[PDB]
């Protein structure tokens, strides 16, 4: 089994060589770095720039030290760090959405809706598994979210891949003669669903906390016209269309700081967190120690140099450690042309 790591990357930095004559050396260095750093994810964008995903700022600092000195002894250009986002849907699809196969006979329509509070977390932690008999999945869902029978029995697959936080469901009104045909096309509509949910339509990212419940698939003739490669793009397009009509949103990762500061350093920490879009869950004295323990969340995008500010302003005291905690929806509306922000 592949290693199950205790954190995600959610910290992006884009690099390219100082002079373009040494791009192959940068590529070799990136390959070696990807070998050596387990959660590093080297990716190539359409602009040709290379992004690197690491756990945090110290992770990327050590990674870039190795890239510059260890592997590719060149000079590189490093962009400012940015978080890795995700897209979700906050409301059910406003209208039904349909797509047609290139043969223009098989019509597939989909509707989507947000999940309840628990299901995403319970999928990630392992309270549910796809590699389970349907009976256990059905009873778990019914017992825990008061879901009804056939919907619980119709869970097809999770995406993208196992541990993914998207549910493929089908509501075909039963009374369907072509159970064999539907079962034949299900095994390769799964792949289209995974393809769509891995690469979001809102942006080239993953989708989170959305169930794509199938509504109606109609196809009259015999099996020669049922091509998996003919039908997958239809599934991906209908998934995209339903998700877009579902009023999509952006998810951002949030850390979980843990500051150990004396009593007199509390106001500085509170001010820093309030300025940096973070809020304090818990502020208690540490038992057996003269220090105070502060536990708080802060978005990854706003945690650039939080540790440095904290240690400088508290005269060296107040050491803090940042752990990736969960995903949070950005307060704005991603698709709102009425907003024209000033680019400073």
């Amino acid at each position: 089994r592949p290693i199950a790591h205790m954190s995600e990357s959610v910290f992006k930095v884009a690099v390219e060589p100082h002079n373009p004559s040494e791009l192959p050396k940068l590529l070799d260095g990136l390959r070696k770095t990807n070998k050596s750093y387990p959660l590093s994810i080297t990716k190539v964008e359409e602009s040709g720039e290379h992004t690197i995903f690491g756990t945090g700022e110290m992770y990327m600092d050590c990674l870039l030290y190795d890239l510059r000195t260890l592997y590719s002894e060149i000079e590189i250009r490093v962009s400012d760090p940015v978080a890795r986002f995700c897209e979700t849907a906050v409301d059910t699809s406003s209208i039904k959405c349909f797509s047609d196969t290139p043969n223009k006979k098989n019509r597939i329509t989909m509707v989507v809706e947000p999940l309840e509070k628990g299901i995403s977390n319970d999928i990630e932690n392992g309270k549910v598994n796809i590699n389970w008999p349907q009976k256990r999945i059905s009873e778990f869902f019914q017992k825990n979210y008061d879901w009804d029978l056939l919907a619980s029995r119709s869970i097809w697959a999770f995406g993208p891949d196992d541990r993914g936080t998207n549910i493929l469901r089908d509501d075909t009104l039963s009374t369907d003669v072509d159970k064999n045909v539907l079962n034949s096309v299900k095994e390769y509509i799964k792949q289209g669903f995974q393809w769509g949910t891995r690469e979001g339509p809102l942006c080239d990212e993953t989708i989170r906390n959305v169930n794509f419940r199938l509504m109606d698939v109609v196809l009259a003739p015999e099996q020669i016209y049922r091509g998996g490669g003919q039908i997958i793009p239809t599934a991906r397009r209908v998934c995209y269309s339903s998700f877009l009509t579902a009023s999509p949103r952006l998810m951002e990762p949030v850390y979980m700081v843990e500051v150990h500061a004396p009593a007199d350093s509390l106001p500085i920490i509170y001010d820093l967190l309030t300025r940096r879009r973070g809020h304090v869950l818990q502020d208690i004295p540490r038992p057996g120690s003269p220090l105070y323990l502060v536990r708080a969340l802060i978005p990854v995008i706003d945690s650039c140099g939080f540790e440095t500010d904290l240690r400088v302003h508290t005269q060296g005291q107040a050491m803090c450690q940042m752990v990736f905690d969960h995903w949070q929806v950005v307060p704005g509306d991603p698709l709102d042309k009425s907003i024209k922000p000033k680019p400073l």
Binding site: P2, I3, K32, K35, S36, D66, L70, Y71
Partner: protein, 50 residues
């Protein structure tokens, strides 16, 4: 589960736990990737042990 740098950043050491069998230097082994399966038989790579 790990790869380690040599004293100079030239070649890597694979850190492995021998679960069964025996291994000798110069042995021919086939390396299986993270997603090798019955569907994906193309991630296998034949390699020697130095």
């Amino acid at each position: 589960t790990k790869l380690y740098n040599t004293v100079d950043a030239n070649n890597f050491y694979a850190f492995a736990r021998v679960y069964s069998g025996q291994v000798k230097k110069g042995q021919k082994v086939k390396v299986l990737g993270e997603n090798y399966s019955l569907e994906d038989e193309e991630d296998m790579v034949v390699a020697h042990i130095a």
